[PDB]
Amino acid sequence: DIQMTQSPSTLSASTGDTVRISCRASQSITGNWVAWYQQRPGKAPRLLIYRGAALLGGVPSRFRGSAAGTDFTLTIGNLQAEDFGTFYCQQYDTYPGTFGQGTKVEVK
Amino acid sequence: NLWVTVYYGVPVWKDAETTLFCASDAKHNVWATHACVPTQEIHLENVTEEFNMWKNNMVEQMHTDIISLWDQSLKPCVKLTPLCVTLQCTNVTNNITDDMRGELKNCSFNMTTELRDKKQKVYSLFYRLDVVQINNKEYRLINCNTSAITQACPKVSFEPIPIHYCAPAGFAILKCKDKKFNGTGPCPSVSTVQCTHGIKPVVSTQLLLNGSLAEEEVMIRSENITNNAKNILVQFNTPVQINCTRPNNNTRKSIRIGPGQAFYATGDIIGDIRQAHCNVSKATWNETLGKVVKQLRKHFGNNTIIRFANSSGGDLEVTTHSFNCGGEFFYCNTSGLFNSTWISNDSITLPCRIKQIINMWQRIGQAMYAPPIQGVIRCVSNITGLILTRDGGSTNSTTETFRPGGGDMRDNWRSELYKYKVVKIEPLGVAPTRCKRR
Amino acid sequence: DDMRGELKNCSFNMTTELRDKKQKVYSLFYRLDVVQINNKEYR
Amino acid sequence: QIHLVQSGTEVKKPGSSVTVSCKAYGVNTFGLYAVNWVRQAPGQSLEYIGQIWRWKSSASHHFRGRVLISAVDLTGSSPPISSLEIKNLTSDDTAVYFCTTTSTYDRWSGLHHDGVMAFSSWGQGTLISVSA
Amino acid sequence: LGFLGAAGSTMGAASMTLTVQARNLLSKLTVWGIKQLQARVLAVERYLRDQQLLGIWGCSGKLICCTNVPWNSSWSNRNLSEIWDNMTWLQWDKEISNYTQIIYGLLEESQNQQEKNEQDLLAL
Amino acid sequence: LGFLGAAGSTMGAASMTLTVQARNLLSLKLTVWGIKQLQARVLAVERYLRDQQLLGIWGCSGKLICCTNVPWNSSWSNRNLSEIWDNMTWLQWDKEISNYTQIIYGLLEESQNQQEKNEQDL
Ligand SMILES: *[C@@H]1O[C@H](CO)[C@@H](O[C@@H]2O[C@H](CO)[C@@H](O[C@@H]3O[C@H](CO[C@H]4O[C@H](CO[C@H]5O[C@H](CO)[C@@H](O)[C@H](O)[C@@H]5O[C@H]5O[C@H](CO)[C@@H](O)[C@H](O)[C@@H]5O)[C@@H](O)[C@H](O[C@H]5O[C@H](CO)[C@@H](O)[C@H](O)[C@@H]5O)[C@@H]4O)[C@@H](O)[C@H](O[C@H]4O[C@H](CO)[C@@H](O)[C@H](O)[C@@H]4O[C@H]4O[C@H](CO)[C@@H](O)[C@H](O)[C@@H]4O[C@H]4O[C@H](CO)[C@@H](O)[C@H](O)[C@@H]4O)[C@@H]3O)[C@H](O)[C@H]2NC(C)=O)[C@H](O)[C@H]1NC(C)=O
Numbered sequence: 002d003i004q005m006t007q008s009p010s011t012l013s014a015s016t017g018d019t020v021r022i023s024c025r026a027s028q029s030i031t032g033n034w035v036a037w038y039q040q041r042p043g044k045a046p047r048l049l050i051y052r053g054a055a056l057l058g059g060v061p062s063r064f065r066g067s068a069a070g071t072d073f074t075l076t077i078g079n080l081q082a083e084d085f086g087t088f089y090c091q092q093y094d095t096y097p098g099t100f101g102q103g104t105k106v107e108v109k
Numbered sequence: 110n111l112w113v114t115v116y117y118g119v120p121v122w123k124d125a126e127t128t129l130f131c132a133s134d135a136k137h138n139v140w141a142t143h144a145c146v147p148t149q150e151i152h153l154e155n156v157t158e159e160f161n162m163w164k165n166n167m168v169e170q171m172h173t174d175i176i177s178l179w180d181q182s183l184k185p186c187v188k189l190t191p192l193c194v195t196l197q198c199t200n201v202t203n204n205i206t207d208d209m210r211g212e213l214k215n216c217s218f219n220m221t222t223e224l225r226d227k228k229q230k231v232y233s234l235f236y237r238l239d240v241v242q243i244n245n246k247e248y249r250l251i252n253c254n255t256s257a258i259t260q261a262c263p264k265v266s267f268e269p270i271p272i273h274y275c276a277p278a279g280f281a282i283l284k285c286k287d288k289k290f291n292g293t294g295p296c297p298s299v300s301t302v303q304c305t306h307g308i309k310p311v312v313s314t315q316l317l318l319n320g321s322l323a324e325e326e327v328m329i330r331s332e333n334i335t336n337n338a339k340n341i342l343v344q345f346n347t348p349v350q351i352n353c354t355r356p357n358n359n360t361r362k363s364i365r366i367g368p369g370q371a372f373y374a375t376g377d378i379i380g381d382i383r384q385a386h387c388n389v390s391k392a393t394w395n396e397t398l399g400k401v402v403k404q405l406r407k408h409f410g411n412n413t414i415i416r417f418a419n420s421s422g423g424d425l426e427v428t429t430h431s432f433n434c435g436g437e438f439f440y441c442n443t444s445g446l447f448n449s450t451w452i453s454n455d456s457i458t459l460p461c462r463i464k465q466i467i468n469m470w471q472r473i474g475q476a477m478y479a480p481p482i483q484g485v486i487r488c489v490s491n492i493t494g495l496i497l498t499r500d501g502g503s504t505n506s507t508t509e510t511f512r513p514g515g516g517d518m519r520d521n522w523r524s525e526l527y528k529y530k531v532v533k534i535e536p537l538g539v540a541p542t543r544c545k546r547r
Numbered sequence: 548d549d550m551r552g553e554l555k556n557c558s559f560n561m562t563t564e565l566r567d568k569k570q571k572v573y574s575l576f577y578r579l580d581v582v583q584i585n586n587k588e589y590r
Numbered sequence: 591q592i593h594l595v596q597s598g599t600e601v602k603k604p605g606s607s608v609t610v611s612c613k614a615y616g617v618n619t620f621g622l623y624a625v626n627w628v629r630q631a632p633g634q635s636l637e638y639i640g641q642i643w644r645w646k647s648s649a650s651h652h653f654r655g656r657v658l659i660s661a662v663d664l665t666g667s668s669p670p671i672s673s674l675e676i677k678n679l680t681s682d683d684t685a686v687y688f689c690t691t692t693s694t695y696d697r698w699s700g701l702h703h704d705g706v707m708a709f710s711s712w713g714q715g716t717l718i719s720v721s722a
Numbered sequence: 723l724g725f726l727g728a729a730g731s732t733m734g735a736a737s738m739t740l741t742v743q744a745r746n747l748l749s750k751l752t753v754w755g756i757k758q759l760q761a762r763v764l765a766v767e768r769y770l771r772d773q774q775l776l777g778i779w780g781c782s783g784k785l786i787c788c789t790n791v792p793w794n795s796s797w798s799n800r801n802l803s804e805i806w807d808n809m810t811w812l813q814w815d816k817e818i819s820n821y822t823q824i825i826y827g828l829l830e831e832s833q834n835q836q837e838k839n840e841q842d843l844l845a846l
Numbered sequence: 847l848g849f850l851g852a853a854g855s856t857m858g859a860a861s862m863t864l865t866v867q868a869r870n871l872l873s874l875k876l877t878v879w880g881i882k883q884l885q886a887r888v889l890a891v892e893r894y895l896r897d898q899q900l901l902g903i904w905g906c907s908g909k910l911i912c913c914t915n916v917p918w919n920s921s922w923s924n925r926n927l928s929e930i931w932d933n934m935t936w937l938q939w940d941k942e943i944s945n946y947t948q949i950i951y952g953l954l955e956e957s958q959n960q961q962e963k964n965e966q967d968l
Pocket residue numbers: 289290291293294609619640644645646647648649653654655656657658659660661662663664671672673674675
């Protein structure tokens with residue numbers, strides 16, 4: 002049972018900035034078994050990044066992910082108007098899987 | 110307090126592809142038997158493997174190899190290029206009975222000789238499907254305005270020889286030993302081998318002849334069961350024999366058309382003119398269809414009516430059962446077998462026609478001309494499978510009609526390579542160990 | 548005015564898919580591809 | 591592509607059972623795939639309920655002996671169906687349930703780690719609100 | 723057991739039959755001739771590309787040869803009991819699949835420094 | 847530095863990056879481009895096995911810097927240990943020992959020979 006902590010809780014940015022979201026686990030996941038999901042408010046969730054630093058077919062190259070010991074970070078550059086939603090960091094190393102806490106990105 | 114140790118020879122394999130070579134044990138043949146090398150199975154435990162027979166690479170490689178082997182024996186012998194002349198064909202009658210008049214014609218035509226400025230008026234016997242009329246009536250060959258006719262080579266044989274596509278060193282072949290395997294999914298009984306068993310390259314549509322049998326029950330295989338455009342493969346558990354024969358003598362006559370160029374045609378028939386026919390047992394076919402429909406009712410429901418009808422229409426090599434017996438290509442109507450309706454000592458005789466101009470592998474531009482065979486032709490064969498299809502209904506009834514189909518030669522070879530997989534061995538490994546150098 | 552005698556309308560016999568039949572067809576050629584033999588005859 | 595539909599909004603009384611279905615379109619066989627069922631409480635985080643892999647259905651350590659997952663293979667006149675039954679529900683089960691699939695064909699795909707895996711395709715989610 | 727017979731055992735139980743898989747890695751212009759020639763060329767190249775990597779690190783003729791590099795704790799924090807008795811070879815290569823290049827790089831310069839340190843030993 | 851990056855340096859600075867050049871000497875129809883790839887692969891096998899066979903008869907198989915018990919003659923070079931490794935390079939040292947290369951290649955063959963099992967076998 003690994004508890005995930007996401008940072009920050011609620012932040013705001015503008016069109017053209019870079020949003021950095023961090024995720025800290027309990028133990029040391031040395032195998033990079035982490036994933037970053039995006040869920041719009043009201044719509045269905047969407048998997049963005051699997052295995053920490055690998056993209057999916059249909060995801061643009063502006064997103065980036067990095068892993069270092071416990072700290073898994075996600076950088077979103079060239080921010081648009083359609084990337085406002087909730088972001089989740091979820092591990093699948095040990096049974097069972099546990100999600101993060103939620104991080105909403107507003108516009109201001 | 111930990112160090113790195115390199116291990117060589119770990120049992121780790123990846124998924125890849127390579128090239129396979131023939132291996133057989135040993136008048137020539139079409140497929141090169143004397144060019145192959147002269148010809149163990151280790152069971153594995155605590156390992157699973159996900160097999161998929163519809164995404165294999167061995168079927169396309171085998172198809173390309175059979176196509177490349179078919180076009181290597183037709184080259185160095187004689188081609189029949191000056192045969193496109195104006196024929197004069199009449200009917201033939203020599204104590205001939207009913208339902209045969211109209212299938213054979215006696216043709217006469219001019220032909221060049223070994224001298225350039227001379228001619229020779231010769232005659233032969235042709236079939237109905239080999240000549241067409243143009244507007245005594247004049248006739249011509251059917252494959253003349255679209256393809257070039259070359260003769261089949263008289264020193265080769267079309268007998269199928271079992272070969273072994275065998276992998277070199279560095280790769281491995283895995284095989285699923287499940288008795289109720291359906292070609293898709295995980296297999297808990299995987300064993301490694303060197304290479305496969307004897308596969309006979311039998312070219313036939315709608316009837317898997319001289320194939321491999323099942324173990325427990327009749328197997329049904331399909332890719333997309335919710336689509337009406339995918340074929341359905343049926344694998345029996347018992348063989349149903351069938352005896353095909355041709356009562357004609359079919360004497361041969363050699364005509365020299367030039368310098369070192371010979372042409373073998375049909376001469377005169379000594380005897381009666383009867384139909385070539387295949388006899389199949391009637392008592393075994395009913396229980397064969399019952400064992401087929403007992404496994405086929407599991408995919409549609411226990412309240413389904415199963416109708417068995419014949420083919421609708423299309424090409425002659427699709428609707429009719431096309432095969433090769435004794436060196437001669439037979440096309441059987443086979444409409445009397447698939448005629449039934451299943452609700453929830455006699456023998457059937459099927460007449461077959463003979464064609465001499467064969468267009469193989471669905472090609473447009475490369476024809477052939479088989480030579481006549483002297484004597485009486487009689488062969489026996491097994492029936493170890495079926496290729497069926499269904500039509501699109503109005504999704505409201507419980508009646509399903511199944512019709513035989515084919516034409517694509519990949520389905521005839523996918524039923525034998527549905528359990529084998531090719532893997533690539535990687536023997537390097539890195540392990541932690543409390544040890545130091547020197 | 549600069550392409551008065553460049554193109555040539557030619558007619559010739561040619562064999563067909565039947566060995567004992569001929570055909571009379573036409574073509575349009577250039578003056579650099581045909582030479583005269585001493586309308587006129589060209590090759 | 592691969593499209594999944596689910597049931598509608600069903601309102602149930604405490605004490606009875608409920609059954610949520612999930613129909614798939616595009617998958618080949620459940621032996622090459624794995625069907626995971628999670629949920630999401632309104633105003634809270636997600637929660638993993640159960641999964642079916644290699645024809646072996648299982649649940650978590652908190653929903654043991656309470657839920658039941660079932661699945662069938664292809665049918666010539668029916669889509670692939672995955673059902674989940676909840677018996678003896680409490681007053682704290684109002685959530686948006688989902689239905690996810692994950693392809694477990696390749697061993698070196700990196701999307702699965704010895705039974706537990708990620709979610710590549712999501713559904714629409716059914717709202718279940720229980721009240722007295 | 724045979725060829726690939728210990729594929730389902732643990733890492734400690736499969737490290738004793740390494741000589742079985744180490745000996746089965748080497749052994750008119752028709753259609754079946756060029757395929758056999760390309761197969762022999764591919765087998766020779768696949769043997770040489772592994773023998774060169776075995777000869778760079780200094781393990782010419784040894785299978786359980788020892789190195790001098792230390793094991794970093796960021797690669798795998800497991801002990802000797804959860805590796806040689808629980809995990810297999812099909813999972814251990816996928817566990818550290820992102821850290822093989824730095825290990826292959828560290829196995830070269832240490833062997834080079836060990837070979838260049840031997841030159842200052844016999845010069846006394 | 848890279849592949850052939852120390853070609854302009856001296857012999858003392860280019861003898862430390864031998865691992866760069868020690869890993870770049872090794873790596874379907876009958877058309878005009880299908881036979882050239884097979885020819886290049888066969889030539890790459892031939893130009894590696896011939897160079898590896900010479901190190902096997904000298905007892906230096908698997909070693910980049912290997913030295914034996916062959917005494918260096920004073921008639922091959924009359925230089926010191928400071929005017930060779932610090933002044934001359936590898937492109938100039940090969941031109942001076944071109945007339946004495948086969949003598950060293952023949953003396954290196956018997957060395958790994960006069961060091962074989964004798965009667966100790968009985
Ligand atoms: C190629 O060939 C392949 C051959 O290998 C072939 O594979 C075969 O595919 C078929 C598919 O057609 C497979 O058949 C199915 O198999 C399913 C497997 O189910 C497994 O799991 C259940 C559940 O286990 C839990 O519960 C039991 C009992 O409590 C416990 O003991 C367990 O430990 C476990 O509990 C854990 O999990 C809990 C959480 O759920 C935890 O709380 C708990 O703590 C535990 O951790 C088992 O019961 C099954 O066992 C049965 O099968 C084994 C097989 O050996 C028997 O030995 C055993 O005695 C049992 O009989 C099994 O292990 C089946 O679930 C599935 O059943 C459905 O179909 C049948 C009819 O065929 C129905 O009778 C059945 O009721 C199911 O139908 C329901 O679901 C469908 C789908 O929605 C509905 O449409 C249907 O209406 C029905 O719903 C109704 O009932 C529901 C309750 O069940 C109810 O909720 C609904 O509301 C509704 O009323 C079916 O049999 C077959 O197994 C494969 N063969 C294999 C794997 O070898 C492949 O397909 C071929 N491919 C092609 C392309 O041809």
